[PDB]
Each structure stands twice: as C-alpha cells, then as structure tokens.
Amino acid sequence: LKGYQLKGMNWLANLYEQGINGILADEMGLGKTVQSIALLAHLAERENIWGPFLIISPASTLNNWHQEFTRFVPKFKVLPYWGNPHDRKVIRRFWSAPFHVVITSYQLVVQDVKYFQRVKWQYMVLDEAQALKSSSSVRWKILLQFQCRNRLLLTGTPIQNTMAELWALLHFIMPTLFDSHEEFNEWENQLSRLHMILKPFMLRRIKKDVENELSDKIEILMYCQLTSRQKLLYQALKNLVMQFRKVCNHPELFERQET
Amino acid sequence: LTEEMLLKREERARKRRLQAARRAEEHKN
Amino acid sequence: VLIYSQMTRMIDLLEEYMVYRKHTYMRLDGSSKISERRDMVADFQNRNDIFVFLLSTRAGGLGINLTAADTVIFYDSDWNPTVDQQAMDRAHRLGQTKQVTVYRLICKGTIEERILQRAKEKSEIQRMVIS
Numbered sequence: 001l002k003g004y005q006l007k008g009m010n011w012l013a014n015l016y017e018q019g020i021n022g023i024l025a026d027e028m029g030l031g032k033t034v035q036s037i038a039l040l041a042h043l044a045e046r047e048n049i050w051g052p053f054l055i056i057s058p059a060s061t062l063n064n065w066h067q068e069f070t071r072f073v074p075k076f077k078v079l080p081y082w083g084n085p086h087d088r089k090v091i092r093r094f095w096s097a098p099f100h101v102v103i104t105s106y107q108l109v110v111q112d113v114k115y116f117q118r119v120k121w122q123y124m125v126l127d128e129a130q131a132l133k134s135s136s137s138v139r140w141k142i143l144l145q146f147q148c149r150n151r152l153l154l155t156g157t158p159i160q161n162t163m164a165e166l167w168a169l170l171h172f173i174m175p176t177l178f179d180s181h182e183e184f185n186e187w188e189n190q191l192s193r194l195h196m197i198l199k200p201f202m203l204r205r206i207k208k209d210v211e212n213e214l215s216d217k218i219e220i221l222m223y224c225q226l227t228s229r230q231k232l233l234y235q236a237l238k239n240l241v242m243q244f245r246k247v248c249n250h251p252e253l254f255e256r257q258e259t
Numbered sequence: 260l261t262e263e264m265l266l267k268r269e270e271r272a273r274k275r276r277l278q279a280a281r282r283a284e285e286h287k288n
Numbered sequence: 289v290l291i292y293s294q295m296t297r298m299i300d301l302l303e304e305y306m307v308y309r310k311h312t313y314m315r316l317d318g319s320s321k322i323s324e325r326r327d328m329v330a331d332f333q334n335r336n337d338i339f340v341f342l343l344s345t346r347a348g349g350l351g352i353n354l355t356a357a358d359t360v361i362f363y364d365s366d367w368n369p370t371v372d373q374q375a376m377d378r379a380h381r382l383g384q385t386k387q388v389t390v391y392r393l394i395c396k397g398t399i400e401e402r403i404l405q406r407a408k409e410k411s412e413i414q415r416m417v418i419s
C-alpha cells in the first residue's frame with residue numbers, strides 16, 4: 001500500500017473497534033478504492049469476511065470498481081447487480097455463501113430495495129455519496145432504512161453546498177447527536193466548533209501531503225465574443241435562463257438555418 | 260426413492276451455478 | 289484533449305462538426321449504456337487512435353480514471369462548483385504523468401459572468417470552510 005493509505009486503514013480499523021462510523025474524504029486520484037480494499041482485507045477475524053459487502057456505487061463506476069476487485073486481491077469474489085431484469089433476477093436468486101462483495105447503482109438499490117431487505121449485510125460502503133445531500137429524496141430514506149451495524153463512506157469533494165447537505169451528511173453518519181435541522185444551524189466561533197466536532201470521525205489529505213511528484217495543473221480562462229446573429233438574438237431576448245444560455249452558447253437551437 | 264429427487268436437486272443447483280457463472284463472464288466484459 | 293459539455297443538443301452539434309472535420313469522435317454520455325461506457329473506457333487506455341473524447345460532467349467525469357489525456361477543455365460553465373472539479377481531477381489523478389492543463393471557454397461577460405462569479409464565491413467558501 002502507501003503510508004497515508006496504511007494510516008487511514010489503521011484509523012478505520014480503530015473506528016470499527018470503537019464502533020464509530022465516519023467518512024473517508026480524500027482528493028481524487030489518491031487511492032480511495034485502494035484504501036477501501038485494504039480496509040476490507042484488514043478484516044481477518046472472520047466477522048465481516050463471512051458476510052457480504054454491499055458496495056453502493058454510482059452506475060458509471062461499476063466496471064472500474066469491478067476490475068479493482070478482480071485485480072487487487074485474487075480472493076474477494078464479486079457478484080455484480082446491474083443489467084437486464086433477467087440477469088439481475090438470476091443473480092438475486094443465486095444467493096437467495098460466496099456473495100463476498102456486491103456492486104449496484106443508486107437507482108437499482110432503491111427500486112429493488114425489497115430484494116436487499118431480505119438479505120442480511122455484514123458491511124456497507126456507499127462510494128461517491130456526494131449525491132446523498134437532499135434528505136427529502138427517496139434515496140436518503142431508502143438508504144437510512146437499511147439495517148446495518150456499520151456504515152462506511154469514501155465520498156470525495158464533500159459539502160460545498162448549503163447547510164441542508166451538512167444536516168443530511170451528519171444525520172446519516174449517526175441518527176443520534178443530531179435531532180433537527182434548525183438545531184444544527186444553531187450549533188469564527190461557529191466554524192471552529194464545527195471543525196472540532198468533525199475532527200475525530202473524519203480524515204483529509206489534500207494534494208500536498210500525498211502528491212510527491214504531480215505538476216500543478218494550469219487553469220486558463222478564455223473569453224469569447226458573440227457573433228452578429230448571436231447579437232441580433234441577444235437584442236431580441238433583452239427587448240428566461242435556459243433559453244438565454246442556449247441562445248448564447250449557440251443560435252442553431254432556436255433557429256436552424258434554412259435552405 | 261427420495262435419492263432421485265435429491266440428486267435432481269443438486270443437478271439443478273449446479274445448472275443454476277453454471278448459468279450464474281455464464282452471466283458473470285458475460286458481465287466481465 | 290478531453291472535452292466536457294452539458295447539453296446533449298450541444299454535444300450533437302459538436303459531433304456534427306467533429307464529423308465535418310476529421311479529428312475522430314468518441315463519446316460516452318448518459319444515454320450510452322453501461323457496457324458501452326466500460327468498453328470505451330477500456331479502449332481509451334491501451335488504445336491511441338481516439339484523439340479526443342467527449343464527455344458530460346455527471347455522466348463521465350465522476351469515477352472514470354481518464355489519466356491518458358493531458359488537457360481538459362470545458363466548453364461550458366456549471367452553476368454548482370465542485371462538479372468541473374471531479375472532471376479536472378479525473379484527468380489530473382495519479383497516472384497523468386505527461387501534463388495537466390484545464391482551459392475554460394467562457395463568454396465576454398454576457399450572462400456567463402454571473403455564473404463564474406457565483407462559482408468563484410462558492411469555491412472560496414468550500415475552500416475555507418474545512419481547510
């Protein structure tokens with residue numbers, strides 16, 4: 001593994017021993033999946049290994065995650081759950097025990113929640129949980145309804161949204177310690193208290209700690225002037241928002257040229 | 260008498276396992 | 289180069305142009321199936337014929353490990369920040385040892401200016417809140 005990697009794995013193992021559940025927020029490219037695989041490997045008492053590992057990742061990340069399991073360790077067995085109703089139903093019937101890890105999308109878990117309910121789950125990790133910020137969504141409630149002792153996350157680039165996001169994140173981390181949204185809102189001073197509260201059950205690396213040789217990307221802006229037709233349309237408009245940005249980006253959408 | 264149904268049971272089980280393996284190797288690409 | 293866009297209509301116009309000029313055209317949008325995604329993503333490592341790759345932010349940037357590319361071009365702006373960030377990093381990860389450069393085609397302060405200002409303010413916030 002790596003230094004930071006091993007340290008995060010040890011922190012996760014210590015939190016598991018203490019029974020705490022937390023996030024694993026690191027920059028993209030630092031090896032989140034590798035750290036999760038190492039943490040899964042660390043389990044040797046035959047407690048989590050005996051049961052399954054529900055990995056609820058986004059749809060796009062099904063194949064890379066899958067490959068990562070088929071290459072990182074020749075021991076873990078994957079039982080993908082994403083595809084035609086037939087194949088998925090057959091896979092569900094199969095375990096209905098070598099079901100080590102399971103790969104499923106967010107929508108597939110919510111739709112087929114009943115299938116997952118009848119199966120007990122030793123460990124659950126929901127990668128890329130940056131989507132799980134709105135508590136009013138059905139996804140949040142469905143994820144909350146699962147009966148799992150330990151919850152782990154590998155979501156990156158956290159927060160940055162409104163306080164709603166923060167309420168959702170924290171209340172998911174633990175049902176206790178958090179009661180109402182406005183309450184959380186009530187709890188320089190504010191920022192320091194929030195940092196102190198989130199310090200124990202969270203990590204962070206950034207790019208300087210882990211990037212030992214990574215050229216600092218160069219970001220370049222480029223203003224572009226609107227053309228004649230674009231201006232005639234912008235004038236018409238001036239004299240909504242979606243239509244507006246469209247007319248800007250390109251006019252063909254509202255006025256494909258004729259013959 | 261019940262041995263034939265038991266053996267049919269495990270041959271159905273291995274057929275199902277073969278089908279699952281076929282689905283998995285189709286899924287592995 | 290990796291081009292990122294949002295509107296499928298836009299993507300289609302861009303496709304039309306990339307067929308007018310011969311730069312090759314390989315896309316993987318949200319309408320593309322997961323198997324086709326996985327396929328194109330296997331191709332774009334260990335294959336070099338694809339000059340340019342056409343993605344959308346939510347569909348492709350998050351979790352696709354596109355280290356092969358050296359440059360990222362954002363044709364359009366996003367209201368919520370940390371979304372072009374996913375793409376940026378997806379190209380600037382660990383296997384991108386060649387170079388990293390992220391352009392940003394914006395307009396001359398027409399209506400994009402408000403979006404860029406909001407994005408900069410939100411990025412500054414998210415920067416200082418927890419770091």
Ligand SMILES: Nc1ncnc2c1ncn2[C@@H]1O[C@H](COP(=O)(O)OP(=O)(O)O)[C@@H](O)[C@H]1O
Nearest residue numbers: 001026027028029030031032033034353382383
């Ligand atoms: N020990 C390692 N050896 C080789 N490659 C590694 C190692 N750890 C991480 N990687 C690289 O990290 C990439 C996956 O990182 P990823 O989990 O996508 O990061 P993030 O979770 O920050 O997006 C892979 O391309 C892989 O090559």
Ligand code: BEF
Nearest residue numbers: 028029351352353
């Ligand atoms: F940046 Be990782 F692929 F989400």
